[PDB]
Amino acid sequence: AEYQNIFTQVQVRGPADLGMTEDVNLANRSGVGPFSTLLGWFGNAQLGPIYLGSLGVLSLFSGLMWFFTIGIWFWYQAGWNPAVFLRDLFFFSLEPPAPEYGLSFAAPLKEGGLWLIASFFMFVAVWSWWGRTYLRAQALGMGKHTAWAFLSAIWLWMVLGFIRPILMGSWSEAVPYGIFSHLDWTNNFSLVHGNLHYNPFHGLSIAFLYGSALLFAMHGATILAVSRFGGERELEQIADRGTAAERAALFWRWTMGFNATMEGIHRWAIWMAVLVTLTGGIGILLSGTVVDNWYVWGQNHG
Amino acid sequence: ALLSFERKYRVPGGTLVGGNLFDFWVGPFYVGFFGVATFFFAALGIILIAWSAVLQGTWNPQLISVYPPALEYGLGGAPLAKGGLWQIITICATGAFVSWALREVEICRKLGIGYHIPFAFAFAILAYLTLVLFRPVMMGAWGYAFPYGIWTHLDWVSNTGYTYGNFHYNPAHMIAITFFFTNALALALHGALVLSAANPEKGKEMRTPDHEDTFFRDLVGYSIGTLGIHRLGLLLSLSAVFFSALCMIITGTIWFDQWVDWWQWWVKLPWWANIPGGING
Amino acid sequence: FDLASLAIYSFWIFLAGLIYYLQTENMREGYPLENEDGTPAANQGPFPLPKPKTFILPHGRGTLTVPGPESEDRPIALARTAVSEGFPHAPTGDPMKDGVGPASWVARRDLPELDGHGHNKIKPMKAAAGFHVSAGKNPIGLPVRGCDLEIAGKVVDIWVDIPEQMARFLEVELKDGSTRLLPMQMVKVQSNRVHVNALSSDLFAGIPTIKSPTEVTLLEEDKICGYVAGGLMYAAPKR
Numbered sequence: 041a042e043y044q045n046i047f048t049q050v051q052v053r054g055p056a057d058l059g060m061t062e063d064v065n066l067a068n069r070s071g072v073g074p075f076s077t078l079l080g081w082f083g084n085a086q087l088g089p090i091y092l093g094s095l096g097v098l099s100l101f102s103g104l105m106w107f108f109t110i111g112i113w114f115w116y117q118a119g120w121n122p123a124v125f126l127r128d129l130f131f132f133s134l135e136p137p138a139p140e141y142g143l144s145f146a147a148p149l150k151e152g153g154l155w156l157i158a159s160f161f162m163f164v165a166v167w168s169w170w171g172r173t174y175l176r177a178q179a180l181g182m183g184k185h186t187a188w189a190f191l192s193a194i195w196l197w198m199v200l201g202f203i204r205p206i207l208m209g210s211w212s213e214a215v216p217y218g219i220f221s222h223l224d225w226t227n228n229f230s231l232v233h234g235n236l237h238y239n240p241f242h243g244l245s246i247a248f249l250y251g252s253a254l255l256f257a258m259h260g261a262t263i264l265a266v267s268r269f270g271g272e273r274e275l276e277q278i279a280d281r282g283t284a285a286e287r288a289a290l291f292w293r294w295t296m297g298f299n300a301t302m303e304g305i306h307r308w309a310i311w312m313a314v315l316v317t318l319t320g321g322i323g324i325l326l327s328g329t330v331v332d333n334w335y336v337w338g339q340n341h342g
Numbered sequence: 343a344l345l346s347f348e349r350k351y352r353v354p355g356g357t358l359v360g361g362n363l364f365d366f367w368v369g370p371f372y373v374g375f376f377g378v379a380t381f382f383f384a385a386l387g388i389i390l391i392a393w394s395a396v397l398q399g400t401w402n403p404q405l406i407s408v409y410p411p412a413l414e415y416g417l418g419g420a421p422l423a424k425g426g427l428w429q430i431i432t433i434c435a436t437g438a439f440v441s442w443a444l445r446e447v448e449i450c451r452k453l454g455i456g457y458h459i460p461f462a463f464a465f466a467i468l469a470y471l472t473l474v475l476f477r478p479v480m481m482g483a484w485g486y487a488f489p490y491g492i493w494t495h496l497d498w499v500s501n502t503g504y505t506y507g508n509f510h511y512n513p514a515h516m517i518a519i520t521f522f523f524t525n526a527l528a529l530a531l532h533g534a535l536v537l538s539a540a541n542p543e544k545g546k547e548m549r550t551p552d553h554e555d556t557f558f559r560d561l562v563g564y565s566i567g568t569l570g571i572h573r574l575g576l577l578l579s580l581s582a583v584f585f586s587a588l589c590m591i592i593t594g595t596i597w598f599d600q601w602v603d604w605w606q607w608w609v610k611l612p613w614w615a616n617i618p619g620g621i622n623g
Numbered sequence: 624f625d626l627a628s629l630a631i632y633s634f635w636i637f638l639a640g641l642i643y644y645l646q647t648e649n650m651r652e653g654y655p656l657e658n659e660d661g662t663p664a665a666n667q668g669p670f671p672l673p674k675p676k677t678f679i680l681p682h683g684r685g686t687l688t689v690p691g692p693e694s695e696d697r698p699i700a701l702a703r704t705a706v707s708e709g710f711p712h713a714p715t716g717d718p719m720k721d722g723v724g725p726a727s728w729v730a731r732r733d734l735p736e737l738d739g740h741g742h743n744k745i746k747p748m749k750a751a752a753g754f755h756v757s758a759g760k761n762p763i764g765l766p767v768r769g770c771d772l773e774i775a776g777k778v779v780d781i782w783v784d785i786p787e788q789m790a791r792f793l794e795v796e797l798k799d800g801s802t803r804l805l806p807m808q809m810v811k812v813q814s815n816r817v818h819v820n821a822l823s824s825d826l827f828a829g830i831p832t833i834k835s836p837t838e839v840t841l842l843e844e845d846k847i848c849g850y851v852a853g854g855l856m857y858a859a860p861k862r
């Protein structure tokens with residue numbers, strides 16, 4: 041057996057890496073956590089430091105409030121009996137207000153009120169986390185590609201829980217907070233709209249989801265195959281092409297007739313993943329607002 | 343034509359079969375013995391699909407659909423127009439996919455690189471074979487396989503899934519989906535991270551790998567590292583396809599009920615199945 | 624022609640523009656295409672070359688502008704073996720010494736890669752303030768065995784990527800007392816030895832040497848890793 045570079049053979053450790061400083065406010069960095077030998081077989085062993093500023097604290101607090109709001113509901117649905125809690129944990133569900141309430145915020149607590157409180161907490165948690173991904177990159181002088189990619193995921197979540205219900209006329213169209221119930225919601229969504237397989241934006245979304253697994257399999261395997269020439273040091277291969285970048289390009293050129301560069305493959309990658317939730321959000325947005333039956337809609341076109 | 347750095351790599355050697363007989367390029371494409379094999383299986387499979395289009399009586403690609411044999415044919419051969427073309431096309435596709443993998447091995451050898459890429463591609467071939475070979479044989483009929491048509495094969499997914507209730511409740515399906523979602527999340531983050539270092543703010547020098555590690559520690563308290571992320575992308579995508587094949591090989595072979603039943607074991611344990619209220623009492 | 628129709632049509636036009644941008648971004652190295660004699664090919668394809676972009680390299684190392692006029696900057700000891708294109712080019716010497724085929728190296732800069740602070744990224748442990756082995760088999764002092772099953776030498780140090788806390792090269796002392804670097808990814812650290820499948824014992828001395836005992840430049844890494852990987856093809860009469 042030749043070494044495959046899937047797991048590290050020999051771990052080394054030095055003083056803890058405190059990281060680049062740039063324009064980061066060092067007051068808000070934690071100390072260093074423990075080194076993990078276990079993780080060190082697959083990647084880096086160091087844990088921490090983490091950065092915890094105002095937006096991070098706002099996000100963690102909000103997110104826990106969202107979590108606690110759902111859990112308190114689950115305890116109440118379990119008659120406060122811990123055994124029913126664990127037994128039916130996957131079955132409990134914090135559902136939205138009934139359609140009678142329209143877009144009102146005056147549903148009683150047990151009849152959709154708590155869902156609206158939970159969703160608010162989730163709204164604050166996600167958007168303040170997004171602000172964090174922007175500012176953490178700005179403080180280090182980096183491009184904003186991570187915040188822009190996160191926006192694509194946020195888009196689908198916003199359409200599911202906020203934009204589409206608003207255009208439909210009722211919070212009852214939103215997604216419940218529950219393991220099994222949100223699955224049942226997804227299934228009923230497709231049934232109600234005439235089979236989501238025939239929503240071409242759903243088709244596009246699937247092609248990119250599959251395409252993302254295809255591309256990361258290709259790119260992860262390619263980089264491991266040229267790690268024997270330092271291939272994973274992708275930034276310096278961008279600044280000064282080495283035999284790793286040439287052989288990686290030539291494998292794919294000889295195999296399928298064209299190739300990428302060490303920088304350009306990361307543009308293929310970011311766009312392949314981002315298009316999943318981009319196309320998906322559009323397809324959900326048009327369902328019930330413009331198109332009631334995708335199969336029938338599909339029939340009268342291609 | 344050659345890339346500007348390509349000539350020095352175009353040496354003889356590395357083939358598995360045929361010596362220097364097929365050791366050459368057509369344009370950018372390397373040939374090799376398994377390039378010839380790939381052409382053979384693909385061309386013939388394309389001819390058959392053309393034949394099946396004539397028998398079907400349509401030239402539009404959205405209507406062409408090559409069906410497998412009726413369930414009554416069991417695991418036996420079928421006449422061409424009654425499930426036989428599907429059988430021969432499946433033979434040619436399998437040959438093409440496997441030939442492609444062995445051509446990649448030869449290219450790996452001429453370039454002196456690891457074999458990770460054909461090894462990863464083999465997982466996709468195994469998923470395909472799970473649906474058209476392993477599962478149908480285990481259930482006893484070629485007609486449990488999917489049809490070769492753009493829209494008919496979507497209908498097959500829906501037919502098969504709803505046969506078992508809401509397929510969402512298949513627990514190996516849950517794990518597969520989790521890997522697919524986590525993969526696209528990791529891919530978006532990795533592409534973004536590298537581009538954000540090579541293309542930093544206006545007025546700045548290129549960032550270093552230490553900035554990438556620092557960004558992710560600041561963000562979530564851990565950086566997997568430049569090698570680990572490519573290990574991780576490989577792991578996530580292959581695990582997604584492994585559990586996909588697993589979730590299908592067990593459906594109709596060791597499980598026949600509505601998948602939501604599987605969890606009702608957790609619900610009807612004798613030490614809490616009878617407690618009133620809640621959801622399951 | 625409803626709104627959903629307009630949207631799906633619009634998306635496909637956006638997708639085609641995206642594909643055209645992505646493909647041109649991926650032609651910043653290695654293009655224009657050349658003929659096998661090195662003159663530019665007549666058929667360059669339907670995508671044009673992108674307009675140049677510039678990278679400002681850290682630590683005062685200059686700028687990079689791509690695409691730009693390309694050059695191998697090294698002799699290539701190969702000869703054309705056919706009038707028609709599409710056939711292999713054959714080595715005119717020793718392909719492992721001449722660095723062609725799977726033994727190829729690229730003329731990268733003869734400078735070490737630096738970390739975020741401007742210090743050498745890769746260092747021998749004995750110069751690496753505070754570094755040490757933490758898990759797995761410590762190979763220092765182990766003997767190094769080639770694919771001929773003879774011993775070539777023994778491990779006298781580990782070269783570590785400081786910022787990423789990773790072992791990248793083994794430093795191996797040969798019978799004459801000189802040393803060579805061996806890429807971590809091409810060795811198997813076993814309980815009683817380091818085994819190297821790519822090279823026979825008598826090919827270790829031909830691993831290219833580095834000019835300083837405490838740093839390795841990008842050019843040196845490419846020559847070293849190219850040489851070692853070329854042994855998979857060219858040391859095969861000894862495997």
Ligand code: BCL
Binds near residue numbers: 237251496
């Ligand atoms: C994986 C689990 C299911 C399944 C469930 C679904 C669902 C659900 C959907 C699809 C969709 C598609 N599936 Mg399917 N599909 C399966 C098996 C297959 C196989 C196969 C040989 O195993 C193939 C070739 C396809 C092919 C396709 C495409 C037509 C389409 C987008 C895929 C994509 O971009 O992926 C990622 C790959 C890439 C980006 C790279 C390019 C791949 C190219 C485009 C594939 C083209 C094949 C060509 C049409 C047929 C051969 C032509 C030759 C000339 C003979 N499916 C099995 C049965 N598939 C979607 C759709 O819209 O269908 C109409 C969709 O919504």
Ligand code: BCL
Binds near residue numbers: 200226230
């Ligand atoms: C019976 C069920 C229906 C169906 C109903 C639906 C519905 C309904 C939807 C999908 C959607 C999707 N479907 Mg479908 N689907 C069916 C059949 C399939 C088949 C198949 C084999 O046939 C496949 C492969 C797919 C595949 C897919 C995906 C391409 C797509 C979701 C993208 C994604 O990444 O979402 C995952 C990503 C997100 C939800 C974004 C999340 C972002 C937020 C910001 C994250 C917050 C995290 C939170 C704070 C918690 C943090 C915790 C801390 C980490 C501790 N479907 C059938 C026809 N499908 C979606 C879509 O886009 O449709 C067009 C969708 O809404």
Ligand code: BCL
Binds near residue numbers: 509588
């Ligand atoms: C639609 C009704 C059911 C359902 C029923 C099923 C059924 C039934 C199945 C799945 C399967 C899958 N489902 Mg489900 N599923 C549903 C809802 C979902 C949802 C969701 C959000 O609701 C999601 C995300 C998923 C997700 C998934 C994946 C785990 C998996 C498909 C990928 C796969 O196996 O690829 C594997 C990859 C391949 C098969 C591709 C192989 C390609 C080959 C090797 C080469 C092709 C080459 C090409 C022809 C060459 C062309 C020429 C070039 C273009 C130049 N399902 C609902 C509840 N689901 C499938 C599965 O697990 O399969 C194992 C499956 O059969």
Ligand SMILES: CC[C@H]1c2cc3[nH]c4c(c3C)C(=O)[C@H](C(=O)OC)c4c3nc(cc4[nH]c(cc(n2)[C@@H]1C)c(C(C)=O)c4C)[C@@H](C)[C@@H]3CCC(=O)OC/C=C(\C)CCC[C@H](C)CCC[C@H](C)CCCC(C)C
Binds near residue numbers: 170
């Ligand atoms: C391109 C599309 C894909 C995508 C992209 C994407 N997601 C992203 C980003 C990007 C580019 C980010 O930058 C961002 C991120 O920070 O990544 C690390 C994010 C992210 N995507 C996430 C999740 C996520 N993304 C998903 C999907 C996808 N994301 C798409 C597939 C999914 C699903 C359903 O598939 C999920 C669940 C997060 C990891 C992160 C957003 C973080 C965030 O918004 O947090 C707000 C909430 C909190 C801060 C608090 C949550 C609290 C917990 C719910 C409970 C705690 C329990 C208990 C008290 C503690 C446990 C303790 C024990 C461990 C000791």
Ligand SMILES: CC[C@H]1c2cc3[nH]c4c(c3C)C(=O)[C@H](C(=O)OC)c4c3nc(cc4[nH]c(cc(n2)[C@@H]1C)c(C(C)=O)c4C)[C@@H](C)[C@@H]3CCC(=O)OC/C=C(\C)CCC[C@H](C)CCC[C@H](C)CCCC(C)C
Binds near residue numbers: 251261295460
């Ligand atoms: C395991 C992780 C993912 C993966 C990985 C992966 N795929 C790969 C590789 C890797 C590592 C390659 O190296 C290889 C490649 O070369 O990529 C460019 C490949 C590849 N994955 C491809 C497609 C593909 N991969 C997919 C999936 C995945 N690939 C996984 C999710 C999917 C889907 C549906 O999810 C598709 C469509 C190809 C682009 C390529 C393999 C090319 C190949 O084999 O070429 C030889 C064959 C031909 C030229 C044609 C043969 C034609 C048949 C004889 C007739 C048609 C038969 C077919 C059954 C009809 C189907 C009709 C549909 C409507 C159902």
Ligand SMILES: COC1=C(OC)C(=O)C(C/C=C(\C)CC/C=C(\C)CC/C=C(\C)CC/C=C(\C)CC/C=C(\C)CC/C=C(\C)CC/C=C(/C)CC/C=C(\C)CC/C=C(\C)CCC=C(C)C)=C(C)C1=O
Binds near residue numbers: 295296300
């Ligand atoms: C870091 O690194 C990285 C890179 O790089 C730096 C990369 O690039 C890549 C690669 C990734 C990308 C480029 C990104 C884009 C890729 C995707 C989005 C994934 C999706 C991919 C596709 C959809 C493309 C798929 C296309 C395929 C599968 C190839 C198409 C195939 C053909 C057109 C057919 C040709 C191929 C065949 C059949 C093989 C055999 C070759 C032949 C020509 C057939 C044989 C012909 C003959 C027999 C002729 C014989 C002639 C004779 C005998 C006469 C000779 C003459 C005499 C005089 C004697 C990655 C991952 C990477 O991480």
Ligand SMILES: COC(C)(C)C(=O)C/C=C(\C)CC/C=C(\C)CC/C=C(\C)CCCC/C(C)=C/CC[C@H](C)CC/C=C(\C)CCC=C(C)C
Binds near residue numbers: 156163202
């Ligand atoms: C011991 O247990 C305790 C009590 C400690 C617990 O806390 C137990 C905790 C649990 C058991 C956790 C249970 C949690 C879950 C099961 C989570 C499941 C969640 C999902 C499956 C999410 C599915 C989708 C969610 C969506 C789509 C949300 C959308 C949100 C909206 C976009 C936000 C809308 C905001 C509104 C309406 C407020 C308006 C705001 C303005 C500014 C006007």
Ligand SMILES: CCCCCCCC/C=C/CCCCCCCC(=O)OC[C@@H](O)COP(=O)(O)O
Binds near residue numbers: 188189195
């Ligand atoms: C009406 C329907 C349209 C969609 C609605 C809005 C959805 C939100 C989605 C946002 C766009 C998707 C992400 C863009 C691609 C990923 C990022 C990218 O590659 O470009 C960013 C790049 O420049 C770097 O940013 P800078 O450092 O600031 O230049």
Ligand SMILES: CCCCCCCC/C=C\CCCCCCCC(=O)OC[C@@H](O)COP(=O)(O)O
Binds near residue numbers: 644
């Ligand atoms: C021949 C094909 C013609 C197709 C028809 C015409 C075009 C169709 C419509 C739309 C095409 C949209 C292409 C968008 C390309 C992405 C542009 C982009 O991303 O710009 C920002 C980018 O610099 C940031 O650079 P970095 O910060 O360095 O990453």
Ligand SMILES: CCCCCCCC/C=C\CCCCCCCC(=O)OC[C@H](O)CO
Binds near residue numbers: 563565571
């Ligand atoms: C205080 C300690 C708290 C620790 C809590 C840790 C939770 C996150 C763990 C794994 C997420 C990994 C996601 C992988 C995506 C990384 C994308 C990438 O490219 O990273 C490369 C590397 O990090 C630089 O190059």
Ligand SMILES: CCCCCCCCCCCC[N+](C)(C)[O-]
Binds near residue numbers: 239243251311312
């Ligand atoms: C960024 C790479 C682009 C990948 C292109 C993917 C093409 C998939 C086409 C699927 C077609 C879906 N639909 C319903 C419109 O036919």
Ligand SMILES: CCCCCCCCCCCC[N+](C)(C)[O-]
Binds near residue numbers: 298
């Ligand atoms: C769905 C992703 C596939 C998109 C296909 C892009 C085709 C690129 C072909 C570029 C031609 C390369 N060449 C020969 C000019 O060097």
Ligand SMILES: CCCCCCCCCCCCCCC
Binds near residue numbers: 296
């Ligand atoms: C579903 C569409 C798939 C498109 C596959 C494109 C193949 C392109 C091969 C490029 C070869 C160009 C060589 C010209 C010298």
Ligand SMILES: CCCCCCCCCCCCCCC
Binds near residue numbers: 417419429436
């Ligand atoms: C008398 C023989 C009748 C059975 C023929 C079955 C052909 C279809 C099976 C597909 C096999 C795909 C894998 C081939 C290696």
Ligand SMILES: CCCCCCCCCCCCCCC
Binds near residue numbers: 458461
């Ligand atoms: C089902 C067809 C299999 C085709 C052969 C796949 C090639 C496998 C590569 C062999 C080497 C793997 C070593 C990497 C771990």
Ligand SMILES: [Fe+3]
Binds near residue numbers: 259263
């Ligand atoms: Fe990468």
